[PDB]
Design a protein around this ligand. Structure first.
Ligand SMILES: [Cl-]
Ligand SMILES: [Cl-]
Ligand SMILES: [Cl-]
Ligand SMILES: [Cl-]
Ligand SMILES: [Cl-]
Length: 217
């Protein structure tokens, strides 16, 4: 989680009057020819609150990350209250997009970013360049890492079937129909690795073949 200690230090650095009890963070990721997916995470008292995570889809073939951030802010905060602090995955451009959107809808909350390449902190139209091991820098990196983790999970079910298939393709002498029965039943490698020999065997009608699946898993 985010250290209460470090949350306190963050409040000082950003000159916040209020403790950052609720922090929301945004990742912007684009799927070419389809849409931008904005993934929103929530920390409450420094802990992830996974039930409150949300995504926003902005339909467009080509990325426009600043307009995407603007759209997210207007969509979300027309419905939800503002957090104590909003984190954006990026620097001056991203931070300013969020601030200007907030101004548009008559709302006000602190917005902080982390430059993508330099790990510079962006706040109130300034860069703050901290030493690498500064606790506030580490805290913001933790937020960024959770926004990324949630973002990457948009692809999960697809990625998982594909990785399951790849591992099964090294099982000698199992045909495509049985491999597909396994993929449809288990969905992923983690899932089929929690399964008994008997369970695997029942799905494909063969203990001989299920033993070999277990060998190669
Ligand atoms: Cl929410
Ligand atoms: Cl909602
Ligand atoms: Cl960290
Ligand atoms: Cl998808
Ligand atoms: Cl096939």
């Amino acid at each position: 989680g985010l250290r209460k200690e470090a949350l306190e230090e963050l409040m000082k650095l950003l000159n916040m009057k209020d403790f950052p009890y609720r922090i929301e963070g945004i990742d912007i990721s684009h799927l070419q020819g389809k849409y931008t997916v904005a993934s929103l995470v929530v920390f409450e008292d420094g802990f992830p609150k996974k039930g409150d995570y949300r995504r926003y889809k902005i339909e467009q073939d080509h990325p426009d990350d600043y307009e995407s951030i603007r759209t997210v802010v207007k969509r979300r905060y027309s419905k939800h209250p503002l957090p104590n602090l909003l984190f954006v995955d990026g620097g001056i451009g991203q931070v300013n997009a969020a601030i200007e959107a907030l101004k548009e809808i008559g709302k006000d909350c602190p917005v902080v970013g982390l430059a993508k390449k330099e790990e510079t902190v962006v706040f109130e139209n300034r860069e703050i360049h901290l030493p690498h091991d500064h606790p506030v820098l580490r805290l913001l990196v933790q937020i960024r890492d959770e926004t990324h983790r949630f973002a990457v999970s948009y692809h999960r079910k697809r990625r998982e079937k594909e990785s399951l298939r790849s591992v099964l393709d090294n099982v000698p002498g199992i045909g495509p129909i049985r491999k597909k029965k396994l993929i449809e039943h288990f969905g992923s490698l983690e899932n089929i690795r929690s399964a008994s020999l008997e369970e695997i065997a029942r799905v494909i009608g063969s203990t001989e073949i299920a033993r070999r699946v277990l060998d190669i898993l």
